[PDB]
């Protein structure tokens, strides 16, 4: 039993997939999505393929989808559990909206001032050392999966 909005958004999501990103529903529960984002060009993640997991709660679209990283990523906005840092949800947004923003965080991984985790503290002080760590982990966990 799926709401009509979720059914037709899924169809438009596959008939017009967001560039550089491929997302599919799960065979059992159609509220779970398996996502794959390409590493943006001229970024420390170029050449990599990053898998994610997206879920649509019962309150969607009045509530935002739930995202989590699968492949290990070195990023000041992603934690050790795959949770991403992003109360600015409107029902006009959709799944492709959330995906385009995650893709944009890899295109510009430099941390924002409010970010106060230590992956963000390392990227701030020794940015050159952190960019090569992001380049290293891209070759490890995102180039053969």
């Amino acid at each position: 039993g799926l709401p009509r909005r979720i059914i037709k958004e899924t169809q438009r999501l596959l008939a017009e997939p967001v560039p550089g990103i491929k997302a599919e529903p799960d065979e059992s529960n159609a509220r779970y999505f398996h996502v794959v984002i390409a590493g943006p060009q001229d970024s420390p993640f170029e050449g990599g393929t990053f898998k994610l997991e997206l879920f649509l709660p019962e309150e969607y679209p009045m509530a935002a989808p739930k995202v989590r990283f699968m492949t290990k990523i070195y990023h000041p906005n992603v934690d050790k559990l795959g949770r991403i840092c992003l109360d600015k949800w409107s029902p006009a947004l959709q799944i492709r909206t959330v995906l385009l923003s995650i893709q944009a965080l890899l295109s510009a991984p430099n941390p924002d001032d409010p970010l106060a985790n230590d992956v963000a503290e390392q990227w701030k002080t020794n940015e050159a050392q952190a960019i090569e760590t992001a380049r290293a982990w891209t070759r490890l966990y995102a180039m053969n999966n």
Partner: protein, 375 residues
């Protein structure tokens, strides 16, 4: 003593000193941060080490990133405490479609512009509710509520705003929307076809009523603030402006200045900068609105990612301004007085050493008060 010298001095001092430009004693920052953070102290094991755990992760000496606070500090320095207080008594003017009223308020003098930008935050959700269960004090704000005899908008102040519908009309809408998933749903669904059902017809009709009434309801909330410094120039074609800003979710004025974005935007020219700023409030293309918003207000280097995806600027914006004249001597003395305060209470050979002493003295005052209430 030029207006340009005023720009270079405040840029130099904010870059070098950050939060110390406000002239607040470090002990006060540490004491106020202490009373704020006394709840976050872990009271299980070693309390002396648990207090230092809170002090180490402190941010009391990192500069504000509120755009409004940054604008308050710019005005205080350029106009003085009394001059700033008079400047805020002035009233904002809505920027014209082309920006002519602002272009015509810079008569080649040392001028300070303060800007407040509002976003229209109209409701996007609705819910059917019975009058007996509708409590405006606790219900979700900025939302439409369809009762069996009335259509109301609950604004952000918790006030019931009537949308001019009769009981017969609302009774028809209330009774036509029966699908359980549509009792508490959204306005302006893209898949609601009013020719496929009486429920979808009623939902589309309600959306049209709300859109027409909301055009006349003040949903404007201030979302951004900054200042523009327009120094005097020799030629009429040599005059340039300098925008100063912090941004809540993004950056401080120190980072703004450190990235030279004030000078990068200054190269757009006075008419070029105003043209984009005026277009920001007039365009109906959310993609154009986003890229202009990113170009003008993003931190340096994030202009293309600032307002994409979830940060796309879907709501209308309006730009308001106010202008007053700057006395360079007043501004340069206000800046020198801050330098005197810094050189006297936090001495050092260079700016970097003075900031570290300032942070240490703020940290030990925070430890002293936290311990005076927890040991």
């Amino acid at each position: 003593k030029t207006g340009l010298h005023v720009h270079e001095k405040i840029k130099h001092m904010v870059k070098n000193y950050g939060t110390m430009i406000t002239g607040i004693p470090a002990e006060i920052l540490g004491q106020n941060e202490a009373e704020i953070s006394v709840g976050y102290v872990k009271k299980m094991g070693n309390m002396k080490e648990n207090i230092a755990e809170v002090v180490r992760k402190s941010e009391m000496t990192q500069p504000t990133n509120s755009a409004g606070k940054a604008s308050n500090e710019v005005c205080d320095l350029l106009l003085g405490t009394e001059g700033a207080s008079e400047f805020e008594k002035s009233s904002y003017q809505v920027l014209s479609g082309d920006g002519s009223n602002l272009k015509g308020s810079l008569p080649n003098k040392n001028l300070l512009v303060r800007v407040e930008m509002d976003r229209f935050n109209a409701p996007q959700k609705y819910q059917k509710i019975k009058r007996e269960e509708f409590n405006p004090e606790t219900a979700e704000k900025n939302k439409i509520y369809l009762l069996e005899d009335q259509l109301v908008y609950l604004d952000i102040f918790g006030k019931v705003i009537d949308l001019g519908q009769t009981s017969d009309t609302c009774h028809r809408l209330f009774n036509a929307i029966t699908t359980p998933f549509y009792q508490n749903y959204i306005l302006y669904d893209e898949y609601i076809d009013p020719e496929e059902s009486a429920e979808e017809a009623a939902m589309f009709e309600m959306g049209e009523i709300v859109k027409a009434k909301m055009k006349n309801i003040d949903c404007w909330t201030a979302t951004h603030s900054f200042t523009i410094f327009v120094p005097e120039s020799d030629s009429e074609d040599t005059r340039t402006l300098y925008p100063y800003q912090a941004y809540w979710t993004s950056h401080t004025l120190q980072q703004w200045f450190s990235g030279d974005k004030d000078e990068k935007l200054s190269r757009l020219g006075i008419d070029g900068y105003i043209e984009k700023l005026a277009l920001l409030g007039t365009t109906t293309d959310s993609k154009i609105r986003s890229s202009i918003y990113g170009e003008l207000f993003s931190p340096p280097g994030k202009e293309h990612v600032f307002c994409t995806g979830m940060n796309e600027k879907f709501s209308p914006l309006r730009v308001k301004f106010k202008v007053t004249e700057v006395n360079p001597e007043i501004a340069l003395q206000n800046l020198e007085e801050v330098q005197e305060f810094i050189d006297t209470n936090y001495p050092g050979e260079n700016a970097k050493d003075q900031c570290e002493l300032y942070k240490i003295k703020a940290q030990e005052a925070m430890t002293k008060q936290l311990e005076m209430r927890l040991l």
